[PDB]
Design an enzyme around this catalytic site. Structure first.
Site, PDB file in Angstrom:
ATOM      1  N   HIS A   1     -29.035   3.400  38.058  1.00 18.70           N
ATOM      2  CA  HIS A   1     -30.077   2.529  38.587  1.00 18.70           C
ATOM      3  C   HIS A   1     -30.518   2.894  39.992  1.00 18.70           C
ATOM      4  O   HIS A   1     -31.462   2.275  40.513  1.00 18.70           O
ATOM      5  CB  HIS A   1     -29.688   1.043  38.507  1.00 18.70           C
TER       6      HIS A   1
ATOM      7  N   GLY B   1     -25.314  -2.551  48.329  1.00 19.39           N
ATOM      8  CA  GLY B   1     -25.087  -1.172  48.708  1.00 19.39           C
ATOM      9  C   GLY B   1     -23.741  -0.627  48.276  1.00 19.39           C
ATOM     10  O   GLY B   1     -23.449   0.551  48.535  1.00 19.39           O
TER      11      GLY B   1
ATOM     12  N   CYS C   1     -22.715  -0.363  45.025  1.00 13.56           N
ATOM     13  CA  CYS C   1     -22.719   0.307  43.728  1.00 13.56           C
ATOM     14  C   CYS C   1     -22.382   1.785  43.896  1.00 13.56           C
ATOM     15  O   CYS C   1     -22.700   2.405  44.910  1.00 13.56           O
ATOM     16  CB  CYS C   1     -24.069   0.147  43.045  1.00 13.56           C
TER      17      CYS C   1
HETATM   18  C1  LIG Z   1     -25.327  -2.256  43.668  1.00 11.59           C
HETATM   19  O1  LIG Z   1     -26.602  -1.806  43.342  1.00 11.59           O
HETATM   20  C2  LIG Z   1     -25.384  -3.784  43.494  1.00 11.59           C
HETATM   21  C3  LIG Z   1     -24.040  -4.460  43.793  1.00 11.59           C
HETATM   22  C4  LIG Z   1     -24.164  -6.007  43.835  1.00 11.59           C
HETATM   23  C5  LIG Z   1     -25.094  -6.417  44.976  1.00 11.59           C
HETATM   24  C6  LIG Z   1     -24.398  -7.591  45.687  1.00 11.59           C
HETATM   25  N1  LIG Z   1     -23.020  -7.571  45.266  1.00 11.59           N
HETATM   26  C7  LIG Z   1     -22.866  -6.597  44.120  1.00 11.59           C
HETATM   27  O2  LIG Z   1     -21.845  -6.341  43.566  1.00 11.59           O
HETATM   28  N2  LIG Z   1     -25.753  -4.011  42.120  1.00 11.59           N
HETATM   29  C8  LIG Z   1     -26.897  -4.828  41.772  1.00 11.59           C
HETATM   30  O3  LIG Z   1     -27.556  -5.350  42.606  1.00 11.59           O
HETATM   31  C9  LIG Z   1     -27.217  -4.982  40.294  1.00 11.59           C
HETATM   32  C10 LIG Z   1     -28.181  -3.884  39.850  1.00 11.59           C
HETATM   33  C11 LIG Z   1     -28.570  -3.981  38.375  1.00 11.59           C
HETATM   34  C12 LIG Z   1     -27.390  -4.376  37.485  1.00 11.59           C
HETATM   35  C13 LIG Z   1     -29.211  -2.692  37.863  1.00 11.59           C
HETATM   36  N3  LIG Z   1     -27.832  -6.267  40.063  1.00 11.59           N
HETATM   37  C14 LIG Z   1     -26.986  -7.394  39.775  1.00 11.59           C
HETATM   38  O4  LIG Z   1     -25.826  -7.329  40.036  1.00 11.59           O
HETATM   39  O5  LIG Z   1     -27.560  -8.531  39.192  1.00 11.59           O
HETATM   40  C15 LIG Z   1     -26.697  -9.292  38.397  1.00 11.59           C
HETATM   41  C16 LIG Z   1     -27.377  -9.739  37.095  1.00 11.59           C
HETATM   42  C17 LIG Z   1     -27.230  -8.635  36.045  1.00 11.59           C
HETATM   43  C18 LIG Z   1     -28.865 -10.008  37.307  1.00 11.59           C
HETATM   44  S1  LIG Z   1     -26.566 -11.270  36.499  1.00 11.59           S
HETATM   45  C19 LIG Z   1     -26.895 -12.598  37.693  1.00 11.59           C
HETATM   46  C20 LIG Z   1     -27.896 -13.528  37.438  1.00 11.59           C
HETATM   47  C21 LIG Z   1     -28.147 -14.539  38.351  1.00 11.59           C
HETATM   48  C22 LIG Z   1     -27.399 -14.620  39.517  1.00 11.59           C
HETATM   49  C23 LIG Z   1     -26.398 -13.687  39.770  1.00 11.59           C
HETATM   50 CL1  LIG Z   1     -25.425 -13.777  41.265  1.00 11.59          CL
HETATM   51  C24 LIG Z   1     -26.147 -12.680  38.856  1.00 11.59           C
END
Ligand SMILES: *[C@@H](O)[C@H](C[C@@H]1CCNC1=O)NC(=O)[C@H](CC(C)C)NC(=O)OCC(C)(C)Sc1cccc(Cl)c1
Ligand SMILES: [Cl-]
Lengths: 302, 300
Positions: free
Chosen positions: A41, A143, A145
């Site tokens: 991603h 950041g 990931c």
């Molecule tokens: C690294 O890119 C990042 C790590 C997270 C950011 C803050 N703390 C983390 O561990 N990963 C992401 O942002 C994800 C990227 C996507 C999966 C390509 N996004 C993410 O984690 O979103 C969670 C979901 C899948 C949307 S479930 C969810 C729904 C509503 C509220 C919350 Cl808290 C989660």
């Protein structure tokens, strides 16, 4: 008390962390020999994150769109491919700090160290357990990931986890280093939720063995059980059923104490059905489920 | 969203070596052309009960000290003693020597421990200097010379070197000048620590962490003065909270909008009533080995 969560020394993994940037999106990658591994991603704009067409996003990408850096030093990308949810970037330099390593897919209940990283720089290291619902209770911010989870066996780093997401309940999910998610999750910014968690029975048994080894043995009884009868009871207490692999990895603690695995299960069964009756085990009225049989060996005998 | 997190240990792993004298092997710390290690390596069994260390060291030669960095022996060309630390001058400089300093930490401060055996790193974990100057570590035979440290910017601040275990299972050691933390002595005797207390400012930092991660069943509408809180704290063998501690907590207060003395009021209620089945951040006990700095670094 007596035991603490101990991580593996992180130096061999620190020597493999880099950053990977597409546009303004920077996450962490893992640099082993002449390949960099990172979450696919990284190639996403936020518009295309709601539901990405990763194969099509990648067709538009060229080697020269990827900025890979070890610190401030760029590593030229000379090839790219996608494997499940991980990107593999071939680079023109073999990492001189590459350890002996392997890629392993762990089972729920197994523990591993996480090297939390931001923009390619390590911030901290801690010990995680893979929950039976295929999440970990990590500590991860924006950041993070591409941070990896690992175990070390003698000379060899076994990489088992790469970080991709945080769920509503505040727990974390990710893939193995072949890009296959643990659990039913997908790398899309769509609402997802962790299944109901259960207690890691094999680890609780390891903890009772540890208590016995340290002389705390009031909970042993003179009875036994079958594996099937125990599993059917355990499930009623939101405990995971035991597998044959669980019975096997308890083997060394069974031998050290002379207590057969199924006799320890009968003692645990009585604790579940009857409670502690006000007592403690290793100082606690709560049973610990994030120490594996190996963790116990590491700290008691290692 | 909250874990006991240690500093990455790579900069320290590159300094660990093995040091042997007679039948005794423990770890040393190789910085530049000097290896630091506990002086009790020179001890024999017939002297461990009242070792006259100055006397024992003058009887030793540079060649009695086997230093190994991996499969490579380092030649010792000189040796001195500084308090309970032995300093071995070697003929080669460690190229992996990081930017570093030696510091003496205060009780309540935290550091990472790199546990090592035979010069090889085995595990890393976070510890706090207890108010009674022990540390609750995980250390076995052969772990002496393992070090504790913090990292700031690129600089490694070494604060602890491991020397002994007490009968209660806690641990004691020195700073890198060889001075013990606490009233302990590097002779082979059973020793006891003073009564320990709980590190109050750290318990408060951890309650703010539990709020940040959505745990707030323990909050209340009451408020307390600083002195009235400290009276109750001391009654339960908690350290008193200073105004410097209140200030140190401000960021966490601002970040959550909970006044420090309001969180003190919650802690007072927990001390007097208990947790009553409930848990905070997964624990049934109040945690006191996260400093305010710790909690902030990890929620930022
Ligand atoms: C690294 O890119 C990042 C790590 C997270 C950011 C803050 N703390 C983390 O561990 N990963 C992401 O942002 C994800 C990227 C996507 C999966 C390509 N996004 C993410 O984690 O979103 C969670 C979901 C899948 C949307 S479930 C969810 C729904 C509503 C509220 C919350 Cl808290 C989660
Ligand atoms: Cl711990």
């Amino acid at each position: 008390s007596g035991f603490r969560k101990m991580a593996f020394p992180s130096g061999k993994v620190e020597g493999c962390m880099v950053q990977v940037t597409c546009g303004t999106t920077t996450l962490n990658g893992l640099w082993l020999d002449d390949v960099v591994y990172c979450p696919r991603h990284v190639i996403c704009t936020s518009e295309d994150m709601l539901n990405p067409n990763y194969e099509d996003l990648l067709i538009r990408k060229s080697n020269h769109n990827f900025l890979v850096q070890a610190g401030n030093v760029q590593l030229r990308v000379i090839g790219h491919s996608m494997q499940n949810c991980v990107l593999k970037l071939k680079v023109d330099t073999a990492n001189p700090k590459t350890p002996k390593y392997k890629f392993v897919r762990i089972q729920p209940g197994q523990t591993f160290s996480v090297l939390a990283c931001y923009n390619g720089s390590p911030s901290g290291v801690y010990q995680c357990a893979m929950r039976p619902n295929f999440t970990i209770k990590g500590s991860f911010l924006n950041g993070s990931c591409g941070s990896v989870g690992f175990n070390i066996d003698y000379d060899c780093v076994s990489f088992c986890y790469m970080h991709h997401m945080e769920l509503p309940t505040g727990v974390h999910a990710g893939t193995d280093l072949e890009g296959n998610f643990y659990g039913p999750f997908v790398d899309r910014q769509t609402a997802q939720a962790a299944g109901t968690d259960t207690t890691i029975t094999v680890n609780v048994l390891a903890w009772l063995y540890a208590a016995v080894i340290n002389g705390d043995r009031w909970f042993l009884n003179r009875f036994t059980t079958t594996l099937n009868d125990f599993n059917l009871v355990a499930m009623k207490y939101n405990y995971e059923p035991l597998t044959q692999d669980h019975v096997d990895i308890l083997g060394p603690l069974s031998a050290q104490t002379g207590i057969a695995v199924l006799d320890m299960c009968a003692s645990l069964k009585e604790l579940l059905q009857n409670g502690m009756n006000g007592r403690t085990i290793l100082g606690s009225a709560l049973l610990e489920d994030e120490f594996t049989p190996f963790d116990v060996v590491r700290q008691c005998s290692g």
